[PDB]
Amino acid sequence: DIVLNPLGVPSRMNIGQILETHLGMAAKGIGDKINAMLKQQQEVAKLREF
């Protein structure tokens, strides 16, 4: 969706946006994974997983 320049990071020294991004990557996946489970053969087993 967005392309941010990395040169804005090192001088400003605001690391958090990166971590937010990393976790945000992780989160982007897990919900998506859940979505897949939701798509087909949805069962409480998915709940076991969650």
């Binding site: 990395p6 040169l7 090192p10 001088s11 020294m13 690391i15």
Partner: protein, 50 residues
């Protein structure tokens, strides 16, 4: 360390982004770089004493 044709290990400057930006003069200062890598340092008190 990167592999040389003969098979020997050569020592390159590295293309690490913090390092690359710093060395290129694109963005960053050594003092700032150490802020994410090396221990921060001493703070000033408000009186100016350390």
């Amino acid at each position: 360390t990167v592999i040389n044709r003969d098979g020997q290990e050569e020592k390159q400057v590295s293309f690490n982004s913090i390092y690359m930006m710093a060395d290129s003069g694109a963005r960053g200062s050594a003092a700032q770089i150490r802020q994410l890598a090396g221990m921060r340092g001493l703070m000033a008190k408000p009186d100016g004493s350390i």
